Design a protein around this ligand. Sequence first.
Ligand SMILES: [Mn+2]
Length: 176
Amino acid sequence: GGMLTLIQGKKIVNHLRSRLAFEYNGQLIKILSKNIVAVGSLRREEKMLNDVDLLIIVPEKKLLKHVLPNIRIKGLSFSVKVCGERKCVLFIEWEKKTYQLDLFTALAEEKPYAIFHFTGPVSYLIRIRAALKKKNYKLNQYGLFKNQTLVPLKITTEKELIKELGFTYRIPKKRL
DNA sequence: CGGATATCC
DNA sequence: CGGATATC
Ligand SMILES: [Mn+2]
Protein backbone atom coordinates (compact mmCIF):
# COMPACT_ATOMS: atom_id res chain seq x y z
CA GLY A 1 0.00 0.00 0.00
CA GLY A 2 1.01 3.61 -0.65
CA MET A 3 1.69 6.25 2.00
CA LEU A 4 -1.25 8.47 3.01
CA THR A 5 -1.66 11.92 4.50
CA LEU A 6 -3.07 12.17 8.01
CA ILE A 7 -6.30 13.66 6.62
CA GLN A 8 -6.73 10.79 4.13
CA GLY A 9 -6.20 8.30 6.96
CA LYS A 10 -8.84 10.01 9.10
CA LYS A 11 -11.29 10.01 6.18
CA ILE A 12 -10.79 6.25 5.69
CA VAL A 13 -11.32 5.52 9.38
CA ASN A 14 -14.46 7.67 9.55
CA HIS A 15 -15.79 5.60 6.62
CA LEU A 16 -14.90 2.35 8.43
CA ARG A 17 -16.40 3.32 11.82
CA SER A 18 -19.93 2.74 10.47
CA ARG A 19 -19.18 -0.16 8.09
CA LEU A 20 -17.22 -2.81 10.03
CA ALA A 21 -18.87 -6.08 11.01
CA PHE A 22 -18.15 -9.79 11.31
CA GLU A 23 -20.03 -12.80 9.96
CA TYR A 24 -20.82 -15.43 12.60
CA ASN A 25 -23.58 -18.04 13.06
CA GLY A 26 -25.58 -16.66 10.11
CA GLN A 27 -25.52 -13.11 11.51
CA LEU A 28 -23.70 -10.01 10.28
CA ILE A 29 -22.73 -8.46 13.60
CA LYS A 30 -21.73 -4.80 13.77
CA ILE A 31 -18.41 -3.73 15.24
CA LEU A 32 -19.30 -0.60 17.18
CA SER A 33 -17.29 2.60 16.68
CA LYS A 34 -17.38 2.58 20.48
CA ASN A 35 -14.95 -0.35 20.24
CA ILE A 36 -12.71 0.96 17.45
CA VAL A 37 -9.57 2.80 18.52
CA ALA A 38 -7.16 4.42 16.05
CA VAL A 39 -3.59 3.37 16.86
CA GLY A 40 -0.17 3.37 15.16
CA SER A 41 1.01 6.39 13.14
CA LEU A 42 -2.60 7.66 12.92
CA ARG A 43 -2.85 8.00 16.72
CA ARG A 44 0.66 9.51 16.76
CA GLU A 45 -0.78 12.15 14.37
CA GLU A 46 2.05 11.67 11.88
CA LYS A 47 1.82 13.86 8.80
CA MET A 48 2.44 10.88 6.49
CA LEU A 49 1.08 7.43 7.34
CA ASN A 50 2.64 4.08 6.35
CA ASP A 51 -0.81 2.47 6.66
CA VAL A 52 -4.00 2.72 8.74
CA ASP A 53 -3.99 0.85 12.08
CA LEU A 54 -7.15 0.10 14.05
CA LEU A 55 -7.52 -1.65 17.39
CA ILE A 56 -10.83 -3.40 17.90
CA ILE A 57 -11.96 -4.04 21.47
CA VAL A 58 -13.61 -7.46 21.62
CA PRO A 59 -15.63 -7.50 24.86
CA GLU A 60 -16.09 -11.30 24.89
CA LYS A 61 -13.12 -13.69 24.77
CA LYS A 62 -14.90 -16.58 23.03
CA LEU A 63 -15.69 -14.28 20.08
CA LEU A 64 -12.00 -13.59 19.33
CA LYS A 65 -11.84 -16.63 17.09
CA HIS A 66 -14.77 -15.29 15.03
CA VAL A 67 -14.17 -11.52 14.67
CA LEU A 68 -11.11 -10.73 12.49
CA PRO A 69 -11.26 -14.11 10.69
CA ASN A 70 -14.76 -13.17 9.44
CA ILE A 71 -14.29 -9.41 9.15
CA ARG A 72 -16.58 -7.61 6.67
CA ILE A 73 -16.45 -4.06 5.35
CA LYS A 74 -19.53 -2.66 3.64
CA GLY A 75 -18.94 -0.39 0.64
CA LEU A 76 -15.24 -1.15 0.23
CA SER A 77 -13.22 -3.36 -2.11
CA PHE A 78 -10.43 -5.20 -0.31
CA SER A 79 -8.26 -8.29 -0.12
CA VAL A 80 -6.76 -10.09 2.86
CA LYS A 81 -3.00 -10.62 3.17
CA VAL A 82 -2.97 -12.47 6.50
CA CYS A 83 -5.73 -12.83 9.06
CA GLY A 84 -5.78 -14.41 12.50
CA GLU A 85 -7.65 -13.69 15.72
CA ARG A 86 -5.22 -10.95 16.84
CA LYS A 87 -3.85 -9.45 13.59
CA CYS A 88 -5.44 -9.02 10.18
CA VAL A 89 -3.72 -7.19 7.33
CA LEU A 90 -5.95 -5.92 4.53
CA PHE A 91 -5.33 -4.10 1.26
CA ILE A 92 -8.22 -1.74 0.56
CA GLU A 93 -9.16 0.29 -2.50
CA TRP A 94 -9.71 3.96 -1.74
CA GLU A 95 -10.17 6.62 -4.43
CA LYS A 96 -8.28 4.67 -7.12
CA LYS A 97 -5.37 3.75 -4.85
CA THR A 98 -4.46 0.74 -2.69
CA TYR A 99 -3.66 1.16 1.00
CA GLN A 100 -2.79 -1.21 3.81
CA LEU A 101 -5.27 -1.44 6.69
CA ASP A 102 -4.09 -3.33 9.77
CA LEU A 103 -6.66 -4.57 12.27
CA PHE A 104 -5.72 -5.80 15.73
CA THR A 105 -7.86 -7.01 18.64
CA ALA A 106 -7.72 -6.52 22.40
CA LEU A 107 -9.86 -7.88 25.24
CA ALA A 108 -11.25 -5.46 27.85
CA GLU A 109 -8.66 -6.33 30.52
CA GLU A 110 -5.87 -5.72 27.97
CA LYS A 111 -7.06 -2.37 26.64
CA PRO A 112 -4.54 0.10 28.16
CA TYR A 113 -1.65 -2.31 27.49
CA ALA A 114 -2.85 -2.71 23.91
CA ILE A 115 -3.25 1.02 23.30
CA PHE A 116 0.25 1.61 24.74
CA HIS A 117 1.74 -1.15 22.53
CA PHE A 118 -0.02 -0.32 19.27
CA THR A 119 0.58 3.42 19.63
CA GLY A 120 4.36 2.89 19.55
CA PRO A 121 6.58 4.12 18.04
CA VAL A 122 8.76 1.00 18.00
CA SER A 123 11.94 2.76 19.22
CA TYR A 124 10.02 4.05 22.24
CA LEU A 125 8.61 0.59 23.10
CA ILE A 126 12.07 -0.99 22.86
CA ARG A 127 13.60 1.47 25.36
CA ILE A 128 10.73 1.11 27.84
CA ARG A 129 10.71 -2.68 27.64
CA ALA A 130 14.51 -2.86 27.90
CA ALA A 131 14.38 -0.94 31.20
CA LEU A 132 11.64 -3.23 32.52
CA LYS A 133 13.51 -6.32 31.32
CA LYS A 134 16.54 -5.24 33.38
CA LYS A 135 14.30 -5.33 36.48
CA ASN A 136 13.06 -8.84 35.51
CA TYR A 137 9.66 -7.63 34.27
CA LYS A 138 8.10 -8.27 30.85
CA LEU A 139 5.71 -5.79 29.21
CA ASN A 140 3.56 -6.59 26.19
CA GLN A 141 0.17 -5.71 24.64
CA TYR A 142 -1.59 -7.98 27.18
CA GLY A 143 -0.15 -6.96 30.55
CA LEU A 144 2.87 -6.54 32.79
CA PHE A 145 4.47 -9.77 34.00
CA LYS A 146 6.99 -10.91 36.63
CA ASN A 147 8.10 -14.56 36.82
CA GLN A 148 5.46 -15.46 34.21
CA THR A 149 2.79 -14.03 36.56
CA LEU A 150 0.45 -11.18 35.62
CA VAL A 151 1.05 -8.11 37.81
CA PRO A 152 -2.39 -6.81 38.88
CA LEU A 153 -2.15 -3.04 38.30
CA LYS A 154 -5.20 -1.01 39.36
CA ILE A 155 -5.45 1.04 36.16
CA THR A 156 -7.96 1.84 33.43
CA THR A 157 -6.22 4.14 30.94
CA GLU A 158 -2.97 4.19 29.03
CA LYS A 159 -1.95 7.35 30.90
CA GLU A 160 -2.46 5.57 34.23
CA LEU A 161 -0.43 2.59 32.99
CA ILE A 162 2.53 4.75 31.96
CA LYS A 163 2.57 6.49 35.36
CA GLU A 164 2.24 3.15 37.19
CA LEU A 165 5.23 1.77 35.24
CA GLY A 166 7.23 4.80 36.47
CA PHE A 167 7.86 6.59 33.16
CA THR A 168 7.15 10.17 32.06
CA TYR A 169 3.82 10.58 30.28
CA ARG A 170 3.93 12.04 26.78
CA ILE A 171 0.95 12.50 24.48
CA PRO A 172 1.03 10.09 21.49
CA LYS A 173 2.37 12.64 18.97
CA LYS A 174 5.35 13.41 21.26
CA ARG A 175 6.56 9.83 21.91
CA LEU A 176 9.85 8.82 20.32
C1' DC B 1 2.96 -30.61 13.13
C1' DG B 2 5.41 -26.64 13.64
C1' DG B 3 10.37 -24.30 13.07
C1' DA B 4 11.12 -21.38 9.64
C1' DT B 5 10.04 -17.21 7.74
C1' DA B 6 7.15 -13.35 6.77
C1' DT B 7 5.12 -9.67 9.61
C1' DC B 8 2.92 -6.04 13.40
C1' DC B 9 3.65 -1.98 17.07
C1' DC C 1 20.13 -2.76 23.67
C1' DG C 2 11.51 -5.78 23.03
C1' DG C 3 7.80 -8.81 22.49
C1' DA C 4 4.04 -11.18 19.91
C1' DT C 5 1.41 -12.84 15.45
C1' DA C 6 0.26 -15.56 10.90
C1' DT C 7 1.18 -19.36 7.56
C1' DC C 8 2.16 -23.87 6.57
MN1 LIG D 1 0.08 -0.76 10.25
